[PDB]
């Protein structure tokens, strides 16, 4: 039992009611404080207040209700990050309609797969994503209505959220007398998120309202989240359609924070925005740390108010993290680790309990352990195995896929992450890598991160994978973005014999990786397999 790591009691208690009720209540309070800003588009320098956000979301909620949407229905939200993104999200949560965000850069096959799973009756989509939706809806007769998110007028023959609302709301509708729907928060689905899909096509991850309600505890937790304090602004550059961006942003709204967003990253827009908006917290993914590592523009700006930079969703090398923290005059980088299937982060760096390299400690309400791959036995301190976690943010299941659900989550509620991890004498957790990413040369384990960090030492980017053999099983190899034998012999001079770059090198102009910064191990393997 000493080998089960447990979250402590929460510093902010779990709240009663559906996630919709909790968001409604908080945002109505902020709405009544004049000038409170909920979202800011840093690209166009436009703000929207809580009063405006609250009022439009409630109008969208009532309209959707009058349209006939209820807990038997799903909507899709398909959009890049924007001021409008969370309007249909909140509207739907207020009335118990399940929300299925669809990645806005999905190709048509991926997009069709996602909506085939969520089976939406109504699709909310940005101007930019509209055509992809049209290109696949023929195969999805479930869809009865398409609404454009980021237009005020009708747009290409489709209603916008504004004209939709106006065609279903009484003109004398009072937003402040609206009452959100009450329902069973364990049974009623809040979100249907898409999984990563290592085993192929993504799945639909169903998240009861309860898991959002537990997130809101973590979010308001002064130690595992961010204490509610007026005039707090966050700069977020994380995709809203992904678990990382979805449940941080809903938390920030519950906290009454100003969420400063950007539809795409640019170094200077980011840095000026930190300054001019007096940002207290920047929420990043690891891939962006490259730009900030070399400094450049940083020390020009007044970042007096920056308290923390938080990373998640992918590995962050200890070196880069420490380097970037130093430049920003921060003690370190705050981490969070989670999976779509755990709703949000369930390992988080507690305030004042930092340890370089660690992704943090088990959050309140949760437990974690690491197990033997061969027998499933619980392992002890410093022993690497598969990270398993359990707690009330674990998904209720993959939509219409009970087999995959049971393959992931066992009878005691443990979710099997597919990550190799260990914990230390103080209960800090370290992520080694995805198990499927590990390289096995003649029986010995080789972790790509160590070879990558070593290749990064040479005076731009790189990805390490296992080139198959026949005797060795795999040989450590790398694709490298420049700023072969020169690299190979350099590596062999930094590591032990078992983890030398016998696989070779393949030069590319870009290392394949996902939105949140996870390397595409499969694509990198194909690149090496073709070349060498
Ligand atoms: N911090 C991390 N370090 C190393 N690896 C990390 C990681 N986080 C996710 N991963 C990897 O992503 C995989 C899952 O990817 S995923 O399914 O797309 N889902 C996610 O990546 C995911 C879902 S929720 C979430 C986070 N929420 C947060 C809230 C606050 C905060 O400060 C930090 C975070 S991260 N991440 C994991 O299995 C793991 O391999």
Does the annotation mark 440 as catalytic?
Answer: yes
Atom 28 of ligand 1, nearest CA residue: 345
Structure tokens that stand for 280 in this block: 């207290």
Atom 40 of ligand 1, nearest CA residue: 434
CA distances from residue 510 to 258, 396, 457, 483, 520 in whole angstroms, order as listed: 34, 38, 18, 11, 11
Class of domain 50-208: alpha beta
The residue written with tokens 């909620």 in the block is 61
Q: Where are the beta strands (DSSP E) in 340-423?
A: 345-348, 361-362, 367-371, 385-390, 397-398, 415-423
CB-hemisphere CA count at 13 Å for 499? 18
Distance 389 CA to ligand 1 centre (A): 13
The residue written with tokens 């009970």 in the block is 402
The answer, yes or no, to whether any atom of ligand 1 lies below 6 A from the CB of 20, is no
Q: Where are the beta strands (DSSP E) in 18-168?
A: 37-41, 46-49, 74-78, 98-101, 122-125, 145-148
Distance 196 CA to ligand 1 centre (A): 11
Approach to solving: X-ray
CB 383, CB 361: distance < 8 Å: no
Q: Where are the beta strands (DSSP E) in 254-340?
A: 258-261, 281-284, 308-312, 334-338
Does the annotation mark 242 as catalytic?
Answer: yes
C-alpha span between 458 and 440 (Å, rounded): 25
Angle at CA 370, nearest 5°, toward 364 and 374? 155
The answer, yes or no, to whether any atom of ligand 1 lies below 6 A from the CB of 434, is yes
State the closest ligand 1 atom to the C-alpha of 431, by its place in the atom list counted from 1: 4
Please count the helices (runs of H) and the strands (runs of E) in the chain: 15, 26
Contacts 24+ apart (CB under 8 A), 293-297: 293/320, 293/323, 293/324, 293/327, 295/327, 296/267, 297/267, 297/268, 297/271
Structure tokens that stand for 247 in this block: 């449940």
C-alpha span between 219 and 227 (Å, rounded): 8
Atom 31 of ligand 1, nearest CA residue: 336
Distance 362 CA to ligand 1 centre (A): 14
The answer, yes or no, to whether any atom of ligand 1 lies below 6 A from the CB of 421, is no
Distance 195 CA to ligand 1 centre (A): 12
Distance 284 CA to ligand 1 centre (A): 12
CB 113, CB 174: distance < 8 Å: no
Handedness of CA 166, 167, 173, 179 (dihedral sign): negative
Q: Are the folds of 1-12+353-431 and 50-208 the same?
A: no
Nearest to 467 by CA among 495, 504, 498: 504
The answer, yes or no, to whether any atom of ligand 1 lies below 6 A from the CB of 340, is yes
Structure tokens that stand for 142 in this block: 């479930």
Atom 30 of ligand 1, nearest CA residue: 336
The answer, yes or no, to whether any atom of ligand 1 lies below 6 A from the CB of 383, is no
The residue written with tokens 């069709």 in the block is 112
The residue written with tokens 């939200």 in the block is 77
C-alpha span between 387 and 404 (Å, rounded): 18
Atom 21 of ligand 1, nearest CA residue: 313
The residue written with tokens 């699709």 in the block is 123
Question: In CATH terms, is domain 13-49+209-352 a member of 3.40.50.980?
Answer: yes
Strand partners, 416: 388
CB-hemisphere CA count at 13 Å for 214? 22
State the burial class of residue 3 (Cβ atoms within 10 Å of its Cβ: 0-12, 13-18, 19+).
middle
Q: For a pocket test of ligand 1, which of 311, 339, 389 has the largest count of ligand atoms closer than 8 A to its C-beta?
A: 339
The answer, yes or no, to whether any atom of ligand 1 lies below 6 A from the CB of 255, is no
Handedness of CA 114, 182, 340, 260 (dihedral sign): positive
Separation of CA 498 from chain center: 35
Does the annotation mark 518 as catalytic?
Answer: yes
Nearest to 407 by CA among 341, 362, 347: 341
Sheet holding 429-434, edge to edge: 5-6, 367-371, 385-390, 415-423, 429-434
Determine which helix (DSSP H) or strand (DSSP E) holds 488, and give its type and residue range.
Answer: helix 485-492
The answer, yes or no, to whether any atom of ligand 1 lies below 6 A from the CB of 211, is no
Nearest to 284 by CA among 295, 299, 274: 274
Atom 19 of ligand 1, nearest CA residue: 339
What secondary structure letter does DSSP report for 497? G
Cβ within 8 Å of residue 493, ≥6 positions away: none
The three state secondary structure string of 426-445 is: CCCEEEEEEHHHCEEECCEE
State the closest ligand 1 atom to the C-alpha of 514, by its place in the atom list counted from 1: 18
C-alpha span between 244 and 215 (Å, rounded): 11
Q: Where are the alpha helices (DSSP H) in 141-299?
A: 161-166, 209-220, 243-254, 267-276, 289-293
Atom 35 of ligand 1, nearest CA residue: 312
The residue written with tokens 């998240």 in the block is 207
Structure tokens that stand for 218 in this block: 């973590």
The answer, yes or no, to whether any atom of ligand 1 lies below 6 A from the CB of 84, is no
C-alpha span between 324 and 16 (Å, rounded): 40
Distance 264 CA to ligand 1 centre (A): 20
Spans of all domains in the chain: 1-12+353-431, 13-49+209-352, 50-208, 432-532
C-alpha span between 342 and 243 (Å, rounded): 9
Resolution value (Å, 1 decimal)? 2.0
Architecture label for domain 1-12+353-431: Roll (2.30)
Distance 409 CA to ligand 1 centre (A): 18
Separation of CA 407 from chain center: 23
State the burial class of residue 272 (Cβ atoms within 10 Å of its Cβ: 0-12, 13-18, 19+).
middle
Distance 70 CA to ligand 1 centre (A): 31
Structure tokens that stand for 401 in this block: 């896929």
> Which of 65, 168, 215, 428 is an active site residue?
215
CA distances from residue 157 to 85, 123, 124, 152, 154 in whole angstroms, order as listed: 21, 14, 14, 13, 6
State the closest ligand 1 atom to the C-alpha of 283, by its place in the atom list counted from 1: 32
CB 333, CB 348: distance < 8 Å: no
Strand partners, 385: 421
CB 35, CB 105: distance < 8 Å: no
Cβ within 8 Å of residue 90, ≥6 positions away: 20, 23, 24, 27, 53, 57, 60, 61, 253
Q: For a pocket test of ligand 1, which of 220, 237, 313 has the largest count of ligand atoms closer than 8 A to its C-beta?
A: 313
> Which of 18, 121, 211, 340 is an active site residue?
340
CA distances from residue 83 to 44, 96, 150, 518 in whole angstroms, order as listed: 10, 22, 8, 26
State the closest ligand 1 atom to the C-alpha of 418, by its place in the atom list counted from 1: 38
State the burial class of residue 173 (Cβ atoms within 10 Å of its Cβ: 0-12, 13-18, 19+).
middle
Cβ within 8 Å of residue 437, ≥6 positions away: 448, 465, 519, 521
CB 67, CB 60: distance < 8 Å: no
C-alpha span between 177 and 160 (Å, rounded): 24
CA distances from residue 204 to 137, 248, 336, 357, 530 in whole angstroms, order as listed: 18, 20, 23, 32, 33
The answer, yes or no, to whether any atom of ligand 1 lies below 6 A from the CB of 286, is no
Distance 313 CA to ligand 1 centre (A): 3
C-alpha span between 311 and 283 (Å, rounded): 6
Structure tokens that stand for 377 in this block: 């036995």
C-alpha span between 296 and 317 (Å, rounded): 20
CB 340, CB 514: distance < 8 Å: no
> Which of 66, 355, 384, 518 is an active site residue?
518
Distance 239 CA to ligand 1 centre (A): 12
The answer, yes or no, to whether any atom of ligand 1 lies below 6 A from the CB of 480, is no
Nearest to 357 by CA among 306, 417, 314, 315: 315
Nearest 5°: phi and psi at 466? -95, 105
Query: Helix, strand, or coil here: 484?
Result: coil
Query: Helix, strand, or coil here: 15?
Result: coil
Handedness of CA 169, 165, 194, 20 (dihedral sign): negative
The answer, yes or no, to whether any atom of ligand 1 lies below 6 A from the CB of 336, is yes
Structure tokens that stand for 234 in this block: 């966050």
Strand partners, 505: 478
C-alpha span between 406 and 408 (Å, rounded): 5
**What is the DSSP pairing of strand 281-284 with strand 308-312?**
parallel
CB 496, CB 468: distance < 8 Å: no
Nearest 5°: phi and psi at 342? -105, 15
C-alpha span between 519 and 509 (Å, rounded): 15
How many of the other CB atoms lie within 10 Å of CB of 231? 12
Structure tokens that stand for 216 in this block: 């809101």
C-alpha span between 193 and 397 (Å, rounded): 11
The residue written with tokens 């393949």 in the block is 506
């Amino acid at each position: 039992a000493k080998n089960i790591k447990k979250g402590p009691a929460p510093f902010y208690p779990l709240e009663d009611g559906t996630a919709g009720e909790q968001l409604h209540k908080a945002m109505k309070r902020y709405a009544l404080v004049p000038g409170t800003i909920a979202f800011t588009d840093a690209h166009i320098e436009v703000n929207i207040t809580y009063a405006e956000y609250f009022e439009m979301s409630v109008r969208l909620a009532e309209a959707m209700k009058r349209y006939g949407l209820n807990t038997n229905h799903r909507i899709v939200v398909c959009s890049e990050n924007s001021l409008q993104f969370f309007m249909p999200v909140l509207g739907a949560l207020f009335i118990g309609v399940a929300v299925a965000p669809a990645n806005d850069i999905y190709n048509e096959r991926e997009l069709l797969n996602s909506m085939n799973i969520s089976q939406p009756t109504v699709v909310f989509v940005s101007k930019k994503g509209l055509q992809k939706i049209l290109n696949v809806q023929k195969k999805l007769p479930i869809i009865q209505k398409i609404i454009i998110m980021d237009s005020k007028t009708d747009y290409q023959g489709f209603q916008s959220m504004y004209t939709f609302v106006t065609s279903h709301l009484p003109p004398g509708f009072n937003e402040y007398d609206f009452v959100p729907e009450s329902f069973d928060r364990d049974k009623t689905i809040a979100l249907i998120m898409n999984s990563s899909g290592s085993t192929g096509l993504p799945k639909g991850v169903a998240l009861p309202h309860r898991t959002a309600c537990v997130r809101f505890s973590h979010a308001r937790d002064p130690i595992f989240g961010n204490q509610i304090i007026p005039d707090t602004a966050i700069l977020s550059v994380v995709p809203f359609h992904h678990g990382f961006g979805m449940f941080t942003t809903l938390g920030y709204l519950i906290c009454g924070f100003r969420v400063v967003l950007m539809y795409r990253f640019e170094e200077e827009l980011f840095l000026r925005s930190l300054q001019d908006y007096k940002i207290q917290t920047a929420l990043l993914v690891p891939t962006l740390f490259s730009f900030f590592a070399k400094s450049t523009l940083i020390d020009k700006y007044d970042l007096s108010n920056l308290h923390e930079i938080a990373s998640g969703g992918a590995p962050l090398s200890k070196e880069v993290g420490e380097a970037v923290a130093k430049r920003f005059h921060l003690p370190g980088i705050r981490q969070g680790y989670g999976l779509t299937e755990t709703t949000s982060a369930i390992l988080i760096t507690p305030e004042g309990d930092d340890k370089p390299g660690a992704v943090g400690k088990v959050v309140p309400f949760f437990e974690a352990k690491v197990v033997d791959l061969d027998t499933g036995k619980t392992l002890g301190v410093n022993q690497r195995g598969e990270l398993c976690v359990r707690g009330p943010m674990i998904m209720s299941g993959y939509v219409n896929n009970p087999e995959a659900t049971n393959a992931l989550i066992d009878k005691d509620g443990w979710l099997h992450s597919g990550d190799i991890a260990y914990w230390d004498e103080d209960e800090h957790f370290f992520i080694v890598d995805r198990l499927k990413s590990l390289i096995k040369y003649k029986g010995y384990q080789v972790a790509p991160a160590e070879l990558e960090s070593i290749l990064l030492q040479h005076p731009f980017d790189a990805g390490v994978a296992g080139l198959p053999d026949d005797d060795a099983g795999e040989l450590p190899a790398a694709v490298v973005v420049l700023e072969e034998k020169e690299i190979v012999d350099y590596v062999a001079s930094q590591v032990t014999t078992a983890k030398k770059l016998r696989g070779g090198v393949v030069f590319v102009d870009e290392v394949p990786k996902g939105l949140t910064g996870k390397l595409d191990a499969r694509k990198i393997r194909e690149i090496l397999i073709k070349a060498k």
